[PDB]
Design a protein around this ligand. Structure first.
Ligand code: ZN
Ligand code: ZN
Lengths: 209, 558, 538, 114, 96, 114, 82
DNA sequence: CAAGTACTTACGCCTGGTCATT
RNA sequence: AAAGACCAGGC
DNA sequence: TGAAAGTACTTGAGTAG
């Protein structure tokens, strides 16, 4: 029906707020814990021909360390995202000189849209997320351990202590769901803290290739 | 041949032939498996009141203190507040460590593998130094505290003053340190074991010596050992696994090793969150939201009739409600198509799935647009009938309706998640699948909840479903866990599946061997099958690949 | 050497093939010529061909010999001169009053709606052959030759036999449709009634046919190269005796069954060396059966002990290792049929009522039983019970039917199969009439005086007391294990016993009969002893 | 439900609509034969296949030695005590274990399920 | 007589097979328990079972009480012949 | 997945080739709406008249108040049925279910409460 | 690496003990001087074990850390497991 | 970018005899 | 005598 | 009669003035 779509939109917003928080962006506690009833009351309820048109759901966040870069999570209405919508999104980003962005597709993006999304890679990093992938926080799963994005100083210390070339570390594909969750590019190292029935804790580090 | 060259280097890091780090410490703790033994945590299980009563070291009693300690030690403990603060600090540390155990060990399984046997060594200390439990001891509790701290500093797996190495050390012996603090507690050493000073020092010495002997020996070819230790149980396991049917034994080991994309029984265990966990009806309702029920699972029989005019009603028992529908301003005035598809739906399947004819009409209209007529009985009748015409007003309507009916009965997706053949529903008897919680009194308790085992695997859709627990709904196909969750998730899942296939017969393989196999797969960033595609795909040498199933091909490529 | 029983229709179901149900028939012309020229009739799964299949799985197709791809069955039927779809259906469906089978066969007709003449159908078959003919005439001639000679040669290879071939092809399609509707069980794979054993007879015949073909080929070559000159020709010089002598010698010696030049493609492991360590070993080697399936197969089913091995193959004796269940040993009473030409049975059936397939209206075949002799469909019969009683009487008295000929009445399927084929495995069972043995005291009295009385086993069999029962007649036989406990009236379990076993200790073979009290052991220990006895010393 | 054949070429009749008369006509495609139809049902898809097995059973199975027989259940037509009983022996038997009885004695052939 | 409701998750035939296997396995277990409880303290079978040197409780149960259900492919002895396991039985005999 | 799009294209290609304000006093809430496609205002009037004769029967069987407030009651019922249905056939089915429920309530003898 | 900053196990591994015993035994069999006094033992393995216990083996084990650097540990410095 | 095909691999060790080709 | 194939067998 | 699964390859294929 349509309350299913509102439940989906609320859960997507919850997961995206957790995703923005985990990357270190400034999100309020209420944004992280907002009930479905509260979301309907604030955003009108019924999405079809209603107050939430899947626009105005976009969330702008700023990083704790420097409030200049920010990050704008979009919400396209077209089930098949095309060149035009990502183009207008990039224009809006530029007018506010914001750098990183997400695009929460409904079903998928056209191949030309994907090529254009990877085209402006150093200028404006825009990532793509299917709506289905955002209905659960994969990091909240019991099998998924705690991933922490290591800084360059920490990675330098890591390779100094163990005397490792960066390619001797275990790897993790950039398209892995957790790596995509933290938006890790090639080169960064992710610290993985997991419990063990033989040691208690084993901190691994995986390099993104 | 997958892990033949994997060994423990002299920096106590497990590395393959290309100096790639597989495990930072061998078996995540750095100790060889010959010396470890089963022990009980003794702090994970007991309740808050029991934990306090067993470890607190109540120094205020002044009566049991003299019954447990020598005369002078009681006066020292009562008078000196520094000793009291040290004792309270010890207990608070035990409480923190107990919470760490609870998060590390949910399900409350205190049976752990640790290097040196604390209980046996305390018994030996009692017997060697002729401890008389009936008489008070002569050991300062602060001596126990300081001694366990000194031993903690002296038991080192990852050395160096570096904060990184310091944290690695604290992790590598955390389980053993909680075990030592719990077993060597001041209260337990003054009340239960009642050791003496010399016996306590000897106990510290032997703990240190046995722990040092346990540390992995650099040069130990861990990979070959792990491969053989997973192959030896594979010989004795039955090739057959035989109402859920999950493949076990050599076939399941083969599916796990070869990361097969088409397992015989791709299953998905689903845990329900809210009231659906404790209620049969809501559990069945969620199951109806998961299993795939096309129109064939609900249709009794479908037949195409010739109905030149709707008023004719060529089916005799279908007049009344029809003339209720066509006495309205409908499109009958135009050339309504004559051919009719009459589908009778079975009542039993309708009431088993809580479906109604209204919802089937909605599905038909959604999947075929408003340009296809679908008027139904509106139930409350002895026969569930839906009469569908193709109103448009050459592909004559008979053949087109045959194709439409075949499509509806095959792929109409009336309800549920596709590629999910059958979803069961049962209350578990074994404790692993129950809902383990921590009571208010701090005690581990198991609550029986409804769970659903599903044949077919669609992990993302089930996890996204409302009233399905995302933190516990897992699957058993390695590839789908890798695709949905990640590479670490697939590591842990593969460990669990290997553990299942090995331990289904009660057999035990030490965790480090499974850990090394699961790491040698999920280390290069992708699920690397233990097969010619993955042992011969890595960045090893041509001569190592040339010994495993390709020979001339690898040499020609090189 | 085992082989699937030729001249029979077996409806199987592949696990994941593009065919759902496949009826195969291995056809040999009374072992007179050719090894076997099989025919398949499959049903093309459930997935359609775009715009024709929109039901539960249809479009019967036929895989003929020497045709590169499949041919729809209706085209094959029309190629035999049956243009009308009513005639084709009459050959396929025996009673049109059953709409389900018609609904099952209709899309196969819809596939072949385009082709509507005999010549165009034959062209359709021919153009898909090994090499399409340049002209229509060559394609037609090749298609006719494939249809008559190689496709189903056991039913007939002499010209006008097209009607008989049509009836048998319809029978295969009817078995296929029965399996598709579910009215028939899919034929058991390892069912031993579906297996024939080639003893030294058929095997040496198989080699001798090849070597004689070679001797004739060489003599024709010699004569042809000597006749261009036109002087004369001598047979003694032209005949190379080495062909027969050395071919037989090599095949028996090396074990590779066939020509020397084709050793790799030849069957191996036949004609082993008689191991003479122990007498029991010699006997076990002389009485041994070898399933030709590769020993490296991981499928457990072809190695398991089938229920049908009861009294034919020792349940215990089988070599351990990767050849377990595939090398078997005969039970004590097992006898392998040597062969008998089925001329008298056909003559008797024709004289004693029976209506041949040529002179019967197809509508009369629904309610009549179908008499098969050596697998070829010889006709239909109206009163089947009388026929079975009369045939059994003849076989018991051994006048027209020899004792090794099997007669089966599939009652639920209105079929009667008579087998005179060599290779069937049978055991002698005592005959039970009413609820008492025909083995009276007089027979034992004459056998106790076996000397100076000229009473032997053959007199016992010719007196209608004992009867050979092969594996697929054992299905229609209710057997009493022992008389003294089962024939007698009690709380009744079965009051219709048709045969009784002489002694249930004859299920065990030669090497397993030395076991004392074998019923008390665990069966694997009996297998280990069966292996060990051949290695004993004496 | 079944197949209706043409009267001239005996090839299959496919369903058709008579536009001028508005009536179901089974029309032939090998020829021009057209026939008025009375069933008004081109196709029937009994997916539940609630087929009674009594029509398939043949009375000659009564004279099968291997089948079991009871004197407890007499025949409803002739009252003969002995009756040979057997299970479905066919499809849909994986969820059906009902027994079918065929009466004995020649010429009765009655069959029923209990 | 069709008085057995199909257990959820299984068809009627599988439910009946489960009932038969349960009854026969319960019988084997109880008979084996009785045989074990009837062993003299001097029994050599019991001495080797308690010693664990070579043996199992089921071995005593089979050598004294009952050998038990024989399974092929995990189900009971399949109907190799036409609806009968051996010629000596009547068709559709599902008895033990 | 290929079969889905193939059948969709087939159905679209085989079906494509096959292809007023309330007068004065219509008793409907937001009658000038088109949330349900191909639902003519005359169809709404006819469904309202079926509901109104149902309410008249309920009055004759349970003695409701009067027609003056039955007008507003019918307005509310039809508006609720409008908001609970999407396609025209669904609207007809929902009004049929509601009139069947009204008939059930009238036959029970109890007044048609909310 | 240099003599300082030895970051490895102070204990002598079983492989190190095995190979040091084997090499010292071969040296002794090849008329090498024996560092410890011998109580009339003629088995080179037995003399080697006597020397190892007495901590008088003239062998330095070069342990190659995976980065390529090496640590040289004298046999006398390491603590024997047995 | 799917549908089609072909290729490679399928326990370890051990004992004897036989035969054809050299 | 040699390595190639096959066969049977032992654990 | 009664081998079979992962990874290749190997083809044809595929919105405005
Ligand atoms: Zn015609
Ligand atoms: Zn009767």
């Amino acid at each position: 029906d349509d309350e299913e779509e509102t439940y989906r939109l609320w859960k997507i917003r919850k997961t995206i707020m957790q995703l923005c928080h985990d990357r270190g962006y400034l999100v309020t506690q209420d944004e992280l814990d907002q009930t479905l009833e509260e979301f309907k009351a604030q955003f009108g309820d019924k999405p079809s021909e209603g107050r939430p048109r899947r626009t105005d759901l976009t969330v702008l966040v700023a990083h704790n360390d420097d409030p200049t870069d920010q990050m704008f999570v979009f919400f396209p209405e077209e089930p098949k995202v095309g060149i035009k919508t990502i183009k207008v999104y990039c224009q809006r980003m530029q007018e506010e000189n914001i750098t990183r962005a997400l695009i929460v597709v409904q079903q998928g993006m056209t191949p030309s849209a994907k090529q254009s999304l990877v085209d402006m890679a150093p200028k404006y990093i825009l990532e793509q997320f299917l709506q289905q992938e955002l209905l659960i926080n994969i990091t909240e799963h019991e099998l998924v351990p705690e991933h922490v994005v290591m800084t360059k100083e920490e990675v330098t210390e890591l390779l100094a202590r163990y005397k490792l070339r960066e390619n001797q570390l275990p790897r993790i594909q950039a398209g892995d769901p957790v790596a995509r969750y933290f938006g890790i590019k090639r080169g960064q190292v992710v610290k993985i803290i997991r419990p063990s029935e033989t040691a208690g804790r084993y901190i691994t580090y995986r390099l993104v290739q | 041949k997958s892990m033949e060259s994997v060994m423990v280097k002299y920096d106590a890091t497990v590395r393959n032939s290309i100096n790639q780090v597989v495990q930072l410490r061998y078996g995540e703790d750095g100790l060889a498996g010959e010396s470890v033994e089963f022990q009980n945590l003794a702090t994970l299980k007991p309740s808050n009141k029991a934990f306090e009563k067993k470890f607190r070291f109540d120094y205020t009693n002044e009566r049991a203190l003299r019954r447990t300690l020598q005369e002078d030690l009681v006066k020292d403990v009562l008078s000196n507040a520094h000793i009291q603060n040290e004792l309270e600090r010890e207990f608070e540390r035990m409480r923190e460590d107990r919470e760490v155990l609870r998060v590390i060990f949910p399900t409350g399984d205190s049976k752990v593998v640790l290097p040196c046997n604390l209980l046996r060594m305390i018994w030996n200390a009692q017997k060697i130094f002729h401890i008389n439990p009936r008489l008070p001891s002569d050991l300062h509790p602060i001596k126990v505290v300081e001694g366990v701290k000194e031993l903690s500093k002296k038991l080192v797996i990852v050395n160096g003053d570096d904060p990184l190495s310091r944290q690695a050390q604290e992790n590598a012996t955390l389980l053993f340190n909680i075990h030592l603090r719990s077993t060597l507690c001041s209260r337990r050493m003054a009340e239960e074991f009642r050791l003496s000073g010399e016996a306590f020092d000897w106990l510290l010495g032997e703990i240190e010596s046995k722990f040092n002997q346990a540390i992995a020996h650099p040069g130990e070819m861990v990979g070959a050992l792990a491969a053989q230790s997973l192959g030896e149980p594979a010989t004795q396991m039955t090739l057959n696994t035989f109402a859920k049917n999950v493949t076990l034994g050599v076939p399941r080991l083969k599916e796990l090793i070869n990361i097969s994309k088409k397992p015989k029984t791709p299953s998905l265990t689903v845990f329900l969150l809210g009231q659906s966990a404790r209620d049969a009806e809501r559990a069945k309702d969620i199951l109806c939201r998961l299993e795939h029920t096309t129109l064939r699972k609900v249709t009794a029989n479908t037949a195409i009739y010739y109905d030149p005019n709707p008023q004719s009603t060529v089916v005799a028992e279908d007049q009344e409600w029809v003339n209720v529908y066509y006495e309205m301003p409908d499109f009958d005035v135009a050339r309504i198509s004559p051919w009719l598809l009459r589908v009778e739906l079975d009542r039993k399947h309708m009431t088993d799935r809580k479906l109604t004819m209204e919802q089937i009409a909605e599905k038909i209209n959604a999947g075929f647009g408003d340009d296809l007529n679908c008027i139904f009985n509106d139930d409350n009748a002895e026969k569930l009938v839906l009469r569908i015409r193709i109103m448009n007003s050459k592909m004559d309507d008979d053949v087109f309706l045959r194709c439409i009916e075949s499509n509806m009965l095959t792929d109409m997706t009336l309800q549920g998640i596709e590629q999910i053949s059958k979803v069961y529903m049962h209350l578990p008897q074994t404790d692993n699948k129950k809902k383990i919680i921590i009571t208010e009194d701090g005690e581990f308790k198991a609550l029986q909840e409804w769970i659903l085992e599903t044949d077919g695997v669609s992990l993302m859709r089930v996890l996204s479903e409302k009233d399905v627990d995302p933190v516990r709904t897992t699957s058993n196909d390695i590839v789908e866990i890798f695709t949905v969750l990640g590479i670490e998730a697939v590591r842990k899942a593969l460990e669990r599946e290997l553990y299942h296939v090995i331990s289904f017969d009660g057999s035990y393989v030490n965790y480090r061997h499974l850990a090394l196999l699961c790491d040698t797969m999920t280390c290069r960033g992708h699920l690397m099958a233990i097969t010619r595609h993955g042992v011969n795909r890595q960045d090893t040498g041509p001569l190592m690949k040339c010994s495993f199933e390709e020979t001339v091909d690898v040499l020609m490529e090189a | 050497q085992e082989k699937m029983a030729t001249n029979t229709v077996y409806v199987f179901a592949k696990k994941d093939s593009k065919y759902a149900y496949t009826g195969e028939c291995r056809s040999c012309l009374e072992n007179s010529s050719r090894p076997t020229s099989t025919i398949w009739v499959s049903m093309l799964a459930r997935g359609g061909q775009g715009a024709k299949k929109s039901a539960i799985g249809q479009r019967i197709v036929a895989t003929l010999p020497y045709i590169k791809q499949e041919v729809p069955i209706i085209i094959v039927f029309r190629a035999l001169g049956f243009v009308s779809d009513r005639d084709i259906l009459e050959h396929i469906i025996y009673d049109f009053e059953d709409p389900e089978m018609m609904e099952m066969v209709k899309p196969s007709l819809d596939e072949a709606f385009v082709i509507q003449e005999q010549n165009v159908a034959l062209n359709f078959i021919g153009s898909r052959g090994a090499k399409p003919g340049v002209t229509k005439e060559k394609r037609i001639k090749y298609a006719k030759e494939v249809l008559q000679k190689e496709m189903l040669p056991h039913v007939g290879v002499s010209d006008f036999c097209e009607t008989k071939k049509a009836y048998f092809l319809g029978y295969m399609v009817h078995r296929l449709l029965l399996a598709a509707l579910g009215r028939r069980e899919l034929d058991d794979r390892d069912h031993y009634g579906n297996k024939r054993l080639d003893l030294a007879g058929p095997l040496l015949a198989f080699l001798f046919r090849g070597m004689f073909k070679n001797l004739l080929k060489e003599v024709r070559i010699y004569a042809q190269k000597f006749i261009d000159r036109g002087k004369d020709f001598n047979l003694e010089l032209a005949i190379k005796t080495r062909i027969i002598s050395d071919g037989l010698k090599y095949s028996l010696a090396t074990g590779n069954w066939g020509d020397q030049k084709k050793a790799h493609q030849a069957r191996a492991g036949v004609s082993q060396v008689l191991n003479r360590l122990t007498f029991a070993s010699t006997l076990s080697h002389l009485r041994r059966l070898n399933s030709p399936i590769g020993r490296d197969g991981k499928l457990a089913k072809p190695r398991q002990l089938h229920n049908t091995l009861w009294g034919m193959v020792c349940p215990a004796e089988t070599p351990e290792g990767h050849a377990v269940g595939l090398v078997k040993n005969l039970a004590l009473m097992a006898y392998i049929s040597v062969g008998s030409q089925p001329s008298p049975i056909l003559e008797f059936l024709e004289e004693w009522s029976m209506e041949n397939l040529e002179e019967i209206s197809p509508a009369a075949i629904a309610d009549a039983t179908k008499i098969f002799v050596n697998g070829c469909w010889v006709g239909i019969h109206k009163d089947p019970e009388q026929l079975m009683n009369t045939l059994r009487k003849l076989r018991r008295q051994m006048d027209i039917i020899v004792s090794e000929v099997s007669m089966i009445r599939d009652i639920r399927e209105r079929e009667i199969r008579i087998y005179t084929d060599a290779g069937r495995i049978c055991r002698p069972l005592l005959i039970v009439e009413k609820q008492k043995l025909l083995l009276k005291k007089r027979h034992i009295d004459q056998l106790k005086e076996r000397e100076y009385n000229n009473y032997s086993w053959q007199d016992l069999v010719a007196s209608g007391v004992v009867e050979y029962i092969d594996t697929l007649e054992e299905e229609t036989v209710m057997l009493a294990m022992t008389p003294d406990d089962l024939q007698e009236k009690e709380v009744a379990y079965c009051s219709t016993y048709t045969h009784c076993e002489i002694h249930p200790s004859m299920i065990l073979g030669v090497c397993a009969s030395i076991i004392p009290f074998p019923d008390h052991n665990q069966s694997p220990r009996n297998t280990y002893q069966s292996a060990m006895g051949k290695q004993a010393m004496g | 439900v079944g197949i209706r054949f043409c009267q001239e070429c005996n090839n299959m009749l496919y369903p058709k609509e008579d536009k001028e008369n508005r009536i179901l006509l089974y029309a032939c495609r090998n020829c021009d034969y057209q026939q008025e139809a009375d069933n008004s049902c081109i196709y029937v898809n009994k997916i539940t296949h609630e087929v009674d097995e009594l029509t398939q059973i043949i009375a000659d199975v009564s004279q099968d030695p291997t089948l079991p027989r009871t004197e407890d259940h007499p025949c409803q037509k002739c009252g003969h005590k002995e009756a040979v009983f057997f299970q479905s022996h066919s499809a849909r038997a994986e969820d059906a274990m009902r027994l079918y009885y065929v009466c004995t004695a020649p010429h009765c052939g009655h069959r029923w399920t209990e | 007589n069709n008085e057995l409701e199909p257990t959820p998750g299984n068809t009627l035939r599988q439910t009946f097979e489960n009932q038969v296997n349960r009854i026969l396995n319960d019988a084997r277990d109880k008979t084996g328990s009785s045989a074990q409880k009837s062993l003299s303290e001097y029994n050599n079978f019991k001495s080797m079972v308690v010693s664990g040197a070579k043996g199992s409780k089921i071995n005593i149960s089979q050598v004294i009480a009952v050998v038990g259900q024989q399974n092929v492919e995990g189900k009971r002895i399949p109907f190799g012949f036409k609806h009968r396991t051996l010629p000596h039985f009547i068709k559709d005999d599902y008895g033990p | 997945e290929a079969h889905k799009r193939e059948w969709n294209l087939f159905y679209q290609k085989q079906m494509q080739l096959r292809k007023v304000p309330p007068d004065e006093n219509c008793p409907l809430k937001e009658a000038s709406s088109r949330r349900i496609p191909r639902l003519t205002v005359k169809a709404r009037e006819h469904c309202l008249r079926l509901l109104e004769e149902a309410l008249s029967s309920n009055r004759q069987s349970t003695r409701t108040a009067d027609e003056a407030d039955l007008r507003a009651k019918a307005v509310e019922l039809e508006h609720e049925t409008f908001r609970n249905a999407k396609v025209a056939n669904l609207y007809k089915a929902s009004v049929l279910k509601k009139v069947a429920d009204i008939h059930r309530a009238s036959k029970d003898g109890q007044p048609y409460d909310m | 690496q240099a003599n300082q900053k030895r970051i490895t196990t102070p204990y002598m591994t079983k492989y190190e003990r095995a190979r040091v015993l084997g090499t010292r035994a071969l040296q002794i069999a090849m008329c090498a001087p024996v560092m410890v006094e011998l109580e009339g033992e003629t088995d080179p393995l037995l003399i080697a074990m006597k020397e190892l216990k007495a901590r008088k083996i003239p062998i330095i084990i070069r342990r190659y850390l995976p980065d390529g650097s090496y640590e040289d540990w004298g046999v006398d410095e390491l603590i024997i497991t047995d």
